[PDB]
């Protein structure tokens, strides 16, 4: 707090009524400020949960809840569809995966608490976290579950008046809880998955065999909780683990870890590349820290650019602002949401 004026160009703190397990900036941006929006959720103790859209004023600081949609159970994860960001998929504490078009719901929820999702996606037997929309195939959604499977739905092929969709494909390569799943940015047929079986799997949707991946690799010495593909370097990705490390990978040679990022004091739950800078990656978890890494400083640890110490509880999720370089939203288990940007002098050196 004392050093915040020197460590940050922006630090905004907000206490939500209930904690959010998820955070994702919507891509739209609309005075000496602009309005940005976040997809958030609730995590309650036996009370009505909501899918939430919040607004944030950012300089060219007020945070307000714009929309609350009745949701059945806590929102494990919520992700918007790139081709139509009004469409949001959510992971529930039951098996169903839900889809909402927030323009077709009131801004104020009915106190009856009726969850009326636009689609209920069936296929899983248990809850999960991993959720990914295909940026090259509109409406193709991947989901990871504690039932050890990956489901795929094609939302573009659902009947217009249909409210329930069965999984198009179920991928059964893992032998334990599948923690995360992500499509490649460029190859419409490629996606990666990570699981408690300590493996990273690379899948080709053009393959006739849904029980065997294109590549299976022993990624970590503990559960693998997250993955992220580099949006500038098509062959590169990162994984985060209960190992307390982030691993760096090349799709052309997955049997050899390129690098291991070490600083976290506990389990890592989220890893995300910067949307603006190819060598920048961030990671978060149970140690209540969000680390920012710079690949270009490897060997000069030297690759640790910044440690965000604003949270005093486990970090559940974070999201890089797609419109404002170096702005991050991070959320923790103690109801705190932070919107922050490290000092320009830190990344300009």
């Amino acid at each position: 707090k004392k050093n915040t004026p020197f460590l940050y160009d922006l630090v905004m703190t907000h206490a939500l009524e209930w904690p959010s397990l998820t955070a994702q900036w919507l891509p739209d941006v609309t005075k000496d400020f602009s309005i940005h929006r976040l997809v958030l959720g609730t995590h309650t103790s036996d009370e009505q949960n909501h899918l939430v859209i919040a607004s944030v004023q950012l300089p060219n600081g007020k945070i307000e809840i714009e929309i609350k949609i009745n949701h059945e159970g806590e929102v494990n994860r919520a992700r918007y569809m790139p081709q139509n960001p009004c469409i949001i998929a959510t992971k529930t504490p039951s098996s169903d995966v839900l889809v909402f078009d927030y323009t077709k719901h009131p801004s104020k929820p009915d106190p009856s608490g009726e969850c009326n999702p636009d689609l209920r996606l069936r296929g899983h037997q248990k809850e999960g976290y991993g959720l990914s929309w295909n940026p090259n195939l509109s409406g193709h959604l991947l989901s990871a579950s504690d039932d050890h499977t990956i489901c795929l739905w094609d939302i573009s092929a659902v009947p217009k008046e249909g409210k329930v969709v069965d999984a198009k494909t179920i991928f059964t390569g893992h032998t334990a809880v599948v923690e995360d799943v992500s499509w490649h940015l460029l190859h419409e047929s490629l996606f990666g998955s990570v699981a408690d079986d300590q493996k990273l799997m690379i899948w080709d949707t053009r393959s006739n065999n849904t029980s065997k991946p294109s590549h299976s690799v022993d990624a970590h010495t503990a559960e693998v909780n997250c993955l992220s593909f580099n949006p500038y370097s098509e062959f590169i990705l990162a994984t985060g683990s209960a190992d307390k490390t982030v691993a760096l990978w090349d799709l052309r040679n997955l049997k050899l870890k390129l690098h291991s990022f070490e600083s976290h004091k506990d389990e890592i739950f989220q890893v995300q590349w910067s949307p603006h800078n190819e060598t920048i990656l961030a990671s978060s978890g149970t140690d209540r820290r969000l680390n920012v890494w710079d690949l270009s400083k490897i060997g000069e640890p030297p690759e640790l650019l910044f440690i965000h110490g604003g949270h005093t509880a486990k970090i559940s999720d974070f999201s890089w602002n797609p419109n404002e370089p170096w702005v991050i939203c991070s959320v923790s288990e103690d109801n705190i949401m932070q919107v922050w940007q490290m000092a320009e002098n830190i990344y300009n050196d």
């Binding site: 209930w18 904690p19 397990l21 995590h43 103790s45 307000e64 809840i65 806590e74 739950f269 109801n335």
Partner: peptide, 14 residues
Amino acid sequence: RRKQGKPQHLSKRE
């Protein structure tokens, strides 16, 4: 396993 059992309620309604 990934989430707390007793999420706390803060005294606000937004």
